[PDB]
């Protein structure tokens, strides 16, 4: 790998610089290199990894949606035939997106998840696994679509089970997991009632535990609780 000659600490330093410069492709490449050193990641480093890939795939998803909409419009009645170009370019973006997802899943499988014993690290990586299978599911149309959806569900479910046993209801990782699994239910699994129930129960159980928190922890937890409320508002 192109980052094999660079020090772990230098890769982490450069990932932080890349973030400041909004160079998220570079940031992701640096963090991939850092993971491939083979040592476990600290909390800060896990955050760098997640931020980098979230931003790269986020951009690809937004582009994919623009292109898919144009393609859908091209297939309506009365639309003039414009050739294969829209499908081709949507496919190009799609293939790049799938590549990034496969890269992240690969890092998680080789070997981040298996080395992650603490609840905070294990839940974080399993959430990521659910997220990147969810992104694959968003674009899936073939024989394996159900299996891709089930892979997301399984990863999220394992993360949920650990989070409920090992973390308080206000823990930001537990909250963010629940937020995203709720979106999975709504957008991927065609289960809006499950999505709404999860978001509500997560919000309410967090509300009841805020009294235990410092000001700074309260700030962190309430931010994500607001995202849960925002989704509930969108959905009800």
């Amino acid at each position: 790998g192109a980052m094999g000659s660079m020090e772990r600490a230098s890769l982490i330093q450069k990932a932080k610089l890349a973030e400041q410069a909004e160079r998220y492709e570079d940031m992701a490449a640096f963090m991939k290199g850092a993971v491939e050193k083979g040592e476990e990641l600290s909390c800060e480093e896990r955050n760098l990894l997640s931020v980098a890939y979230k931003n790269v795939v986020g951009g690809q998803r937004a582009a994919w949606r623009v292109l898919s909409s144009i393609e859908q419009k091209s297939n309506e009645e009365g639309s003039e035939e414009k050739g294969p170009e829209v499908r081709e370019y949507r496919e190009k973006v799609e293939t790049e997106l799938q590549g990034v997802c496969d890269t992240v899943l690969g890092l998680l499988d080789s070997h981040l998840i298996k080395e992650a014993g603490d609840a905070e690290s294990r839940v974080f990586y399993l959430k990521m696994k659910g997220d990147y299978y969810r992104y694959l599911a968003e674009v899936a149309t073939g024989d394996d679509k159900k299996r891709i959806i089930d892979s997301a569900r399984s990863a999220y479910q394992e993360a949920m089970d650990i989070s409920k046993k090992e973390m308080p209801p206000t823990n930001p990782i537990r909250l963010g997991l629940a937020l995203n699994f709720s979106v999975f239910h709504y957008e991927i699994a065609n289960s809006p009632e499950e999505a709404i129930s999860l978001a509500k129960t997560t919000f309410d159980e967090a509300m009841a535990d805020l009294h235990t928190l410092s000001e700074d922890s309260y700030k962190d937890s309430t931010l994500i609780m607001q995202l849960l409320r925002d989704n509930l508002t969108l959905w009800t």
Partner: peptide
């Protein structure tokens, strides 16, 4: 689109 983190 809904919020995720």
């Amino acid at each position: 689109f809904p919020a995720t983190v």
